[PDB]
Amino acid sequence: SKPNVVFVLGGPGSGKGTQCANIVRDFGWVHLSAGDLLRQEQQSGSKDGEMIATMIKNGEIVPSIVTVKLLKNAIDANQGKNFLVDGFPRNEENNNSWEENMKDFVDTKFVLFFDCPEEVMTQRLLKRGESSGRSDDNIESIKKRFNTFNVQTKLVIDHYNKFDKVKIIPANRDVNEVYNDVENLFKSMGF
Numbered sequence: 001s002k003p004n005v006v007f008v009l010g011g012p013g014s015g016k017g018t019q020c021a022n023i024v025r026d027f028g029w030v031h032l033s034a035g036d037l038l039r040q041e042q043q044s045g046s047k048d049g050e051m052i053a054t055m056i057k058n059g060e061i062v063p064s065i066v067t068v069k070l071l072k073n074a075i076d077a078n079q080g081k082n083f084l085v086d087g088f089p090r091n092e093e094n095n096n097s098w099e100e101n102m103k104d105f106v107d108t109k110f111v112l113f114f115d116c117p118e119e120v121m122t123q124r125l126l127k128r129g130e131s132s133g134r135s136d137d138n139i140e141s142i143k144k145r146f147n148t149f150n151v152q153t154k155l156v157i158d159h160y161n162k163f164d165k166v167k168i169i170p171a172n173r174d175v176n177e178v179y180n181d182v183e184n185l186f187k188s189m190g191f
């Protein structure tokens with residue numbers, strides 16, 4: 001059987017990583033955060049390491065050739081699992097590179113979009129920046145991430161939305177109120 005994939009999209013700090021951990025716990029899917037995979041590769045001392053570092057700091061999207069490879073390696077090592085790919089696709093290139101490399105290998109079911117206001121994401125991110133130790137949790141990078149989201153990623157969401165493949169969860173609530181709807185959706189989808 002081909003894996004099922006759900007793209008988990010949303011703004012910076014909309015809660016994609018938080019809710020994905022809940023889904024892993026209750027449904028046993030594998031959580032692939034693209035942001036985490038890219039950081040990991042950078043921590044590993046690769047060729048692409050100093051490039052990844054600069055782009056993350058400035059809220060730019062890394063070349064897909066790096067990201068899709070990192071996702072494919074993890075997916076190929078976990079035969080028989082379903083996948084939450086978190087924070088991807090974030091632009092058209094991301095999307096095209098996915099469909100070029102993955103389309104006959106997986107079943108991408110829907111985009112789960114966490115909708116949250118910028119003001120709330122900014123606050124969540126400054127708070128997370130006190131302990132995360134991420135290079136992009138400050139208020140310079142945060143605002144760069146917002147622009148990239150607005151200019152590149154919103155187009156991807158509306159592209160899936162015309163094929164009816166976006167589910168929207170409003171994310172400006174308690175973490176458990178948000179998870180209740182997420183759990184209900186995954187149950188209603190037969191997972």
Ligand SMILES: Nc1ncnc2c1ncn2[C@@H]1O[C@H](COP(=O)(O)OP(=O)(O)O)[C@@H](O)[C@H]1O
Nearest residue numbers: 012013014015016017018124128171173174175
């Ligand atoms: N519903 C929520 N309400 C308040 N804090 C939240 C909520 N969801 C997540 N957080 C906090 O917001 C920050 C961003 O969450 P995270 O899941 O890491 O975001 P993302 O992966 O979308 O960038 C974290 O510190 C997290 O603990």
Ligand SMILES: Nc1ccn([C@@H]2O[C@H](COP(=O)(O)O)[C@@H](O)[C@H]2O)c(=O)n1
Nearest residue numbers: 034035055056059060061062087088090
């Ligand atoms: N598809 C993706 C996902 C993450 N990223 C990079 O990783 C950064 C951190 O993303 P996360 O917030 O998802 O960890 C993004 O702002 C971006 O610089 C990327 O370049 N391509």
Ligand SMILES: [Mg+2]
Nearest residue numbers: 016017033035
């Ligand atoms: Mg995250």
